[PDB]
Amino acid sequence: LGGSILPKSAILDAFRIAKEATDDFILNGQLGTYYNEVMPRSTELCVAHIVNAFEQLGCPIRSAAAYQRLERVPYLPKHERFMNLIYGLLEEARLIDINGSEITRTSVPVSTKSVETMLEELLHDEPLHAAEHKLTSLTGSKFADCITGKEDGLQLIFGSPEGREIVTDVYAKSPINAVWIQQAEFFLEQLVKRLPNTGEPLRILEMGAGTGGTTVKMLPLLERLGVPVEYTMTDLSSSLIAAARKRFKKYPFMKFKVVNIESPPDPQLVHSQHIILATNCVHATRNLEISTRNIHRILRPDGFLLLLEMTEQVPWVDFIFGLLEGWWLFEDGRRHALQPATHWKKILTSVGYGHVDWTEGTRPEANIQRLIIALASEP
Numbered sequence: 473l474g475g476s477i478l479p480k481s482a483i484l485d486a487f488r489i490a491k492e493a494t495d496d497f498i499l500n501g502q503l504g505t506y507y508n509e510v511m512p513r514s515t516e517l518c519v520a521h522i523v524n525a526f527e528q529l530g531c532p533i534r535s536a537a538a539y540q541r542l543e544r545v546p547y548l549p550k551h552e553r554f555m556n557l558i559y560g561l562l563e564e565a566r567l568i569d570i571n572g573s574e575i576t577r578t579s580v581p582v583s584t585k586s587v588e589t590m591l592e593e594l595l596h597d598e599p600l601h602a603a604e605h606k607l608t609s610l611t612g613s614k615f616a617d618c619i620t621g622k623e624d625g626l627q628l629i630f631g632s633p634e635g636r637e638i639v640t641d642v643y644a645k646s647p648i649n650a651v652w653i654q655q656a657e658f659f660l661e662q663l664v665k666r667l668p669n670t671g672e673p674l675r676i677l678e679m680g681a682g683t684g685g686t687t688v689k690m691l692p693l694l695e696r697l698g699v700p701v702e703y704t705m706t707d708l709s710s711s712l713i714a715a716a717r718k719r720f721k722k723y724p725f726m727k728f729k730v731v732n733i734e735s736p737p738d739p740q741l742v743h744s745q746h747i748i749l750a751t752n753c754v755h756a757t758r759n760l761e762i763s764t765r766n767i768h769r770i771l772r773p774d775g776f777l778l779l780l781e782m783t784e785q786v787p788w789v790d791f792i793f794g795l796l797e798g799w800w801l802f803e804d805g806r807r808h809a810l811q812p813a814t815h816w817k818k819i820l821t822s823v824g825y826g827h828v829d830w831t832e833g834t835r836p837e838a839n840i841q842r843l844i845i846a847l848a849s850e851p
C-alpha cells in the first residue's frame with residue numbers, strides 16, 4: 473500500500489495560511505457577533521429554563537426575597553457535577569449567591585420574559601444560529617424531568633426526528649461549528665496543492681464523524697480537487713455509520729467503519745493514515761493521553777492529526793450536553809471534558825507528537841473553538 477508523499481513544508485505552510493485567516497473565517501461565516509451579541513441571549517434562555525425547572529422542583533427562586541436561603545433541588549446522583557455547573561450559571565447570572573453548601577437569593581429579579589418569547593425573538597433575530605437555540609429549549613423545557621430521571625436527555629435529542637435534525641444542523645450548519653470546518657477545508661485545499669502527484673492516494677481517516685457535520689464538507693472538497701484519496705469515515709456509533717454509508721455512497725473514494733478512539737489500533741490501522749480528522753470527539757473520551765497515543769499509532773510518520781475542539785466553555789453547550797453521560801466520561805485528571813489548546817499541546821507532546829499548532833485570532837470567538845494540528849514526527 474503505497475501512499476502519497478506528504479512533505480512537512482506542505483503541512484506547515486498550509487496551516488500557517490489557514491491560521492492567519494482565522495478572524496476572516498469568523499467574520500465571513502457570520503460568527504463575528506456571536507460572543508458579544510448571541511451568547512448572552514442563549515445564556516439568558518438557559519437561565520430562564522433553569523429558573524422554571526427549579527420552581528417545578530419546589531424551589532421558589534422566582535419569588536424568593538433577598539438573602540432567602542434556598543434548598544438544593546432534587547436530582548439523580550449522576551448529575552452532581554452537572555448541577556454544580558448549573559448552580560454556577562445561576563450565580564454568574566447573579567440570581568443566587570453560593571457559600572459552600574449554602575445557597576441564598578440575591579436582590580436581582582428573575583426575567584419576566586417567558587422562555588417562549590425569548591426563543592421566538594432569538595430565532596427571529598439570529599436565524600443563522602437557530603439550531604442550538606432550538607436545541608436549548610428542546611432539553612431546557614424538560615430540564616426538571618431530565619435531572620430527576622423522568623426523561624433522559626439522550627432520548628429527547630436523538631429519539632425524535634426533530635431532535636436529530638436539530639443536532640445535525642448544529643454540527644453542520646450553525647456558524648459556531650461551520651466556521652472552523654470551512655477553515656479546515658481551506659487548509660486541506662492549500663495542503664493538497666503542495667503535494668507531489670505519484671498516483672498514490674492520500675489516506676484520510678475521520679474519527680467521531682457522527683452526523684457528518686465535517687464529512688459533508690470534506691467529500692465534495694476532495695471530489696473537486698480530484699487527487700487520489702481514500703477517506704475512511706468512522707465513529708463509535710454503528711447506526712450513524714450505517715446511515716452515512718447510504719448518505720455518502722455517491723463518493724467512490726469512501727470507506728466506512730466503526731472505530732473506538734479509546735481502543736488500541738488493529739494492525740491494519742497502524743501507520744496507515746496521512747491525516748486524522750477529529751471534530752469534538754476526542755474530548756469525550758476517558759483519557760486524552762491514551763486516546764491521542766492511539767491516534768498517533770494510526771498515523772504514518774509523515775502524517776498529522778487535525779483536531780477541531782471547543783477550547784472554551786459556552787453555557788448553552790454545557791446546559792444541553794451536560795445532561796449526557798458522554799460529557800462526563802473523563803477520568804484523567806480533567807474537571808471538564810473540554811480543554812484549552814495549551815493542555816492539548818501538553819498531552820500531544822507527551823505521547824510523541826512532534827509539532828503542535830492551533831488557530832488564533834483577535835476576535836473573541838477565535839478562543840471558543842480551535843483547529844489544533846499535531847504532527848506525528850518532529851520537523
Ligand SMILES: Nc1ncnc2c1ncn2[C@@H]1O[C@H](CSCC[C@H](N)C(=O)O)[C@@H](O)[C@H]1O
Nearest residue numbers: 680681682683684685708732733751752753
Ligand atoms: N470513543 C469514541 N470513539 C469514537 N467516536 C466517539 C467516541 N466517543 C464519542 N464518539 C463520537 O463522537 C461524536 C461527538 S459529536 C461531535 C460532532 C461530530 N463530529 C459530528 O459531526 O456529528 C459522536 O458522533 C460520538 O458518537
